[PDB]
Structure 1
Amino acid sequence: AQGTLYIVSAPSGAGKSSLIQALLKTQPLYDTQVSVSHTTRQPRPGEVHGEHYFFVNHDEFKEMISRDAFLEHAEVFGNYYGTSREAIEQVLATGVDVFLDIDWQGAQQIRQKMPHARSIFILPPSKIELDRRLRGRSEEVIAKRMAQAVAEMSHYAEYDYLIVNDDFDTALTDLKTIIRAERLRMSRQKQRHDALISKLLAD
């Protein structure tokens, strides 16, 4: 029962991170999972293969790049990161919804190799708030992060849904809503309620 793939993107300081987290805490694994990426970097203390990432050796990662195994990948200051098309494809095949957290670039790539995916973009409520959230806990470092954020936000129009994260809860509800709504699509419902519809039409 082909599940849906959600590409979620947002400039640092909108909650993209937290929201997806919160969403999964109220969703059974047979309903919603998060996408798991492949990486060549050493797992940190506490991490675990299969959950956080799919830790593979540098050569394995390359063997894959060659055979077009990744839906998207990129080398980030040292190591490689990638979204195995077979990994996300397998789970979606079991009727599970998958959430993929990526930047606008990877978004475009995935959205290209997979037109059925839905994409959600989260935005901060105002520039002051974006600023405040970014400053988190040098005026020079901030100015850079703020700029990187504006860059990211430029691609907002490329997405399917737009969530403005003013108040966290409301935002988490908007997210939950997008999911639920999609699950109410005819293709999906026709599948889920096969038995019921059969009975109803048959005398």
Structure 2
Amino acid sequence: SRPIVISGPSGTGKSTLLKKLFAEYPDSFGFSVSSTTRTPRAGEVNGKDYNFVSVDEFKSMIKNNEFIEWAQFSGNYYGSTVASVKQVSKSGKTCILDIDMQGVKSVKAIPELNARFLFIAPPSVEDLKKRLEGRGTETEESINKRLSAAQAELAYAETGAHDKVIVNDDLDKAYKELKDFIFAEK
């Protein structure tokens, strides 16, 4: 099919959803094989764990706009290239891109990609904020920055920017929805 861009605030259950999807349909979905400038590791295989490039190869890919998204981690670059997305689809699978709002907007400025856009929303900021403090791995500033950045995404979601929006006030229901949408490829 067409690439499926799935975004939304974390803590909403997006992970369980994608995880359950990838478990239930083990040969049909795929994330894009990411690029890095990080020296390979023991047990990593080029083209499969990562496309390993060089700091200069990565940088020349950035100005050549080959990237959907990229970042710098401790001096190592990461990011996914349009070409690796196509690959997943060349292979006979459906690409899943799990990315932020800024990513959604980038994919959209490449309408040649023809992506699909799915938004996993929390029932409310309240439940999200609370869902967040359930994990237990966070503080004040962290959470607060996590909720401000959600209200932004939520804002972008009210502009009709996505093909579906799934509010997760129940995983099975949402799970059913996530599938009905995916296989409703149009």
**Under a length normalisation based on structure 2, what TM-score does the superposition of the two structures give?**
0.82
Q: Does 1:141 align with 2:126?
A: no
Q: Quick one: which of 16, 21, 24 aligns to 1:23?
A: 21
Q: Does 1:9 align with 2:7?
A: yes
- Give 1:88's aligned amino acid: V
Q: Does 1:121 align with 2:122?
A: no
Alignment match, 1:91: 88
Asked if structure 2 preserves the Cα contact closer than 8 Å seen for 1:11 and 1:150, the reply is no
Q: Does 1:178 align with 2:181?
A: yes
Q: Which runs of 4+ in 1 moved over 6 A?
A: 42-48
Gapped runs of 5+ residues in structure 2? none
The alpha carbon displacement at 1:34 in A equals 2.2
- Give 2:82's aligned amino acid: R
Q: Distance in 2 between matches of 1:145 and 1:112?
A: 26
Q: Does 1:167 align with 2:170?
A: yes
Q: Does 1:103 align with 2:104?
A: no
Secondary structure of 1:114 counterpart = coil
Compute the RMSD of aligned alpha carbons: 2.6
The alpha carbon displacement at 1:43 in A equals 7.1
Alignment match, 2:68: 71
Gapped runs of 5+ residues in structure 1? 186-203
Q: Distance in 1 between matches of 2:44 and 2:171?
A: 27
Name which of structure 1's ranges 44-53 and 13-22 shifts more when overlaid on structure 2.
44-53
The aligned length equals 180
Q: Distance in 1 between matches of 2:110 and 2:180?
A: 26
Q: Distance in 2 between matches of 1:48 and 1:171?
A: 35
When Rg is computed on C-alpha atoms for both structures, the one with the higher figure is: 1
Q: Distance in 2 between matches of 1:179 and 1:114?
A: 19
